Design a protein around this motif. Structure first.
Motif, PDB file in Angstrom:
ATOM      1  N   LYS A  31       7.089  -1.649   5.615  1.00  0.00           N
ATOM      2  CA  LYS A  31       7.112  -2.704   6.613  1.00  0.00           C
ATOM      3  C   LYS A  31       5.689  -3.032   7.090  1.00  0.00           C
ATOM      4  CE  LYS A  31      10.930  -2.699   8.531  1.00  0.00           C
ATOM      5  NZ  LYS A  31      12.169  -2.284   9.260  1.00  0.00           N
ATOM      6  N   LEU A  32       4.959  -2.005   7.535  1.00  0.00           N
ATOM      7  CA  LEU A  32       3.618  -2.175   8.114  1.00  0.00           C
ATOM      8  C   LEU A  32       2.476  -2.160   7.092  1.00  0.00           C
ATOM      9  CD1 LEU A  32       3.719   0.201  11.279  1.00  0.00           C
ATOM     10  CD2 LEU A  32       4.710  -2.088  11.134  1.00  0.00           C
ATOM     11  N   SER A  33       2.802  -1.873   5.831  1.00  0.00           N
ATOM     12  CA  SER A  33       1.818  -1.806   4.735  1.00  0.00           C
ATOM     13  C   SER A  33       0.922  -0.555   4.812  1.00  0.00           C
ATOM     14  CB  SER A  33       0.982  -3.092   4.664  1.00  0.00           C
ATOM     15  OG  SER A  33       0.102  -3.064   3.558  1.00  0.00           O
ATOM     16  N   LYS A  34       0.275  -0.352   5.960  1.00  0.00           N
ATOM     17  CA  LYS A  34      -0.454   0.890   6.242  1.00  0.00           C
ATOM     18  C   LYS A  34      -0.480   1.178   7.741  1.00  0.00           C
ATOM     19  CE  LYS A  34      -4.973  -1.343   5.907  1.00  0.00           C
ATOM     20  NZ  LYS A  34      -6.344  -0.758   6.063  1.00  0.00           N
ATOM     21  N   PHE A  35      -0.933   2.377   8.122  1.00  0.00           N
ATOM     22  CA  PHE A  35      -1.037   2.778   9.529  1.00  0.00           C
ATOM     23  C   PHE A  35      -2.504   2.908   9.970  1.00  0.00           C
ATOM     24  CE2 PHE A  35       3.029   5.439   8.550  1.00  0.00           C
ATOM     25  CZ  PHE A  35       3.816   4.285   8.551  1.00  0.00           C
ATOM     26  N   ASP A  36      -2.769   2.648  11.248  1.00  0.00           N
ATOM     27  CA  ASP A  36      -4.103   2.878  11.793  1.00  0.00           C
ATOM     28  C   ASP A  36      -4.288   4.379  11.993  1.00  0.00           C
ATOM     29  OD1 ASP A  36      -2.742   3.434  14.167  1.00  0.00           O
ATOM     30  OD2 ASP A  36      -3.752   1.949  15.384  1.00  0.00           O
ATOM     31  N   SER A  83       0.429  18.825   0.967  1.00  0.00           N
ATOM     32  CA  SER A  83       1.350  17.794   1.444  1.00  0.00           C
ATOM     33  C   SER A  83       0.776  16.990   2.614  1.00  0.00           C
ATOM     34  CB  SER A  83       2.695  18.414   1.834  1.00  0.00           C
ATOM     35  OG  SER A  83       3.383  18.874   0.687  1.00  0.00           O
ATOM     36  N   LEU A  84       0.156  17.684   3.567  1.00  0.00           N
ATOM     37  CA  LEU A  84      -0.497  17.038   4.708  1.00  0.00           C
ATOM     38  C   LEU A  84      -1.624  16.104   4.279  1.00  0.00           C
ATOM     39  CD1 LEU A  84       1.209  17.901   6.961  1.00  0.00           C
ATOM     40  CD2 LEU A  84      -0.402  19.740   7.503  1.00  0.00           C
ATOM     41  N   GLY A  85      -2.380  16.511   3.258  1.00  0.00           N
ATOM     42  CA  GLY A  85      -3.465  15.693   2.703  1.00  0.00           C
ATOM     43  C   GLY A  85      -3.009  14.451   1.959  1.00  0.00           C
ATOM     44  N   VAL A  86      -2.000  14.604   1.109  1.00  0.00           N
ATOM     45  CA  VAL A  86      -1.389  13.473   0.402  1.00  0.00           C
ATOM     46  C   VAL A  86      -0.781  12.445   1.367  1.00  0.00           C
ATOM     47  CG1 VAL A  86       0.413  12.753  -1.258  1.00  0.00           C
ATOM     48  CG2 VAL A  86      -0.966  14.790  -1.711  1.00  0.00           C
ATOM     49  N   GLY A 135      -1.759   3.465   2.195  1.00  0.00           N
ATOM     50  CA  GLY A 135      -0.516   2.782   1.832  1.00  0.00           C
ATOM     51  C   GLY A 135       0.027   3.150   0.466  1.00  0.00           C
ATOM     52  N   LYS A 136      -0.695   4.008  -0.246  1.00  0.00           N
ATOM     53  CA  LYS A 136      -0.247   4.526  -1.530  1.00  0.00           C
ATOM     54  C   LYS A 136      -0.699   5.978  -1.692  1.00  0.00           C
ATOM     55  CE  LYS A 136      -4.076   2.437  -4.140  1.00  0.00           C
ATOM     56  NZ  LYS A 136      -4.122   1.070  -3.538  1.00  0.00           N
TER      57      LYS A 136
END
Ligand SMILES: CNc1nccc(-c2cccnc2Oc2ccc(NC(=O)Nc3cccc(C(F)(F)F)c3)cc2C)n1
Length: 240
Positions: free
Chosen positions: A99-104, A166-169, A177-178
């Motif tokens: 929805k948001l594409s990416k997060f700040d 997992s936290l890093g990925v 966003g990917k």
């Protein structure tokens, strides 16, 4: 407690999942709103996960944390298994991300903080979570993340301290966003993770690159502890 299907009022479907549909539900004994998953003995048998499910639920029943999706209990009848789960009103992080594409950086740091606190809780009780996908990450009424985890997300040791990788990925995916090792082919994706080949777009700040770079080490032992993630300057500067 001896639960049964008669104890619940069934509402709207909340979508399909692995080995069954999830429904909005309300317990008659408390009027309390929740989610109910319906599973099938035959389907669980055909694969061979019936024994893995019984273990996961026993562990999952003894975990009380605001950033872990609550499993209140479970039951079964002749041909079905039922999971009684906390309902997450705000959906998945997966869906939010598309929805948001990416997060700040405030959204990302706050999420990572929430994850690391849930993963700390699980560490203090010798519970280990493998790979974590955004699909398994749900959102409560106050926007807080909740883990619902009973290739792109797997560490090198699982394909050739898993919590940290997992936290890093996730931290990368949230900002960019990917996932960091995503490619057009499974073989190309394999090579990326094994050799740890990620690059940042120009906008990713240096503080975020430090955290991600420390988290995505090939050697598991060289990854920070969860306390070190929670005390990282980027995290504490940007987390709510
Ligand atoms: C919108 N709000 C909301 N609120 C609560 C739930 C949902 C929800 C909706 C749709 C699907 N899953 C949903 O939640 C989940 C419910 C259980 C699970 N985990 C799961 O099914 N695990 C599972 C299964 C079989 C075998 C195994 C085994 F044992 F083989 F590993 C392990 C994972 C999710 C993500 N949604």
């Amino acid at each position: 407690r001896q639960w049964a299907l008669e104890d619940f009022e069934i509402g709207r479907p909340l979508g399909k999942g692995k080995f069954g549909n999830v429904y909005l539900a309300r317990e008659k004994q408390s009027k309390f709103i929740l989610a109910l998953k319906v599973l099938f003995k035959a389907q669980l048998e055909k694969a061979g996960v019936e024994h893995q499910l019984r273990r996961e639920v026993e562990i999952q029943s003894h975990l009380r944390h605001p950033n872990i999706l609550r499993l209140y209990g479970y039951f079964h009848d002749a041909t079905r298994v039922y999971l009684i789960l906390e309902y997450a009103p705000l959906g998945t992080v997966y869906r939010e991300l598309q929805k948001l594409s990416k997060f700040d950086e405030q959204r990302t740091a706050t999420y990572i903080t929430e994850l690391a606190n849930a993963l700390s809780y699980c560490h203090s009780k010798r519970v280990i979570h493998r790979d974590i996908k955004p699909e398994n990450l749900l959102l409560g009424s106050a926007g807080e993340l909740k883990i619902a985890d009973f290739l792109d997300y797997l560490p090198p040791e699982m394909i050739e301290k898993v919590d940290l990788w997992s936290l890093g990925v996730l931290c990368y995916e949230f900002l960019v966003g990917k996932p960091p090792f995503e490619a057009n082919t499974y073989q190309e994706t394999y090579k990326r993770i094994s050799r740890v080949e990620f690059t940042f777009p120009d906008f990713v700040t240096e503080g975020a690159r430090d955290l991600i770079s420390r988290l995505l080490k090939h050697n598991p032992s060289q990854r920070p502890m969860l306390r070190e993630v929670l005390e990282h300057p980027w995290i504490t500067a940007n987390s709510s």
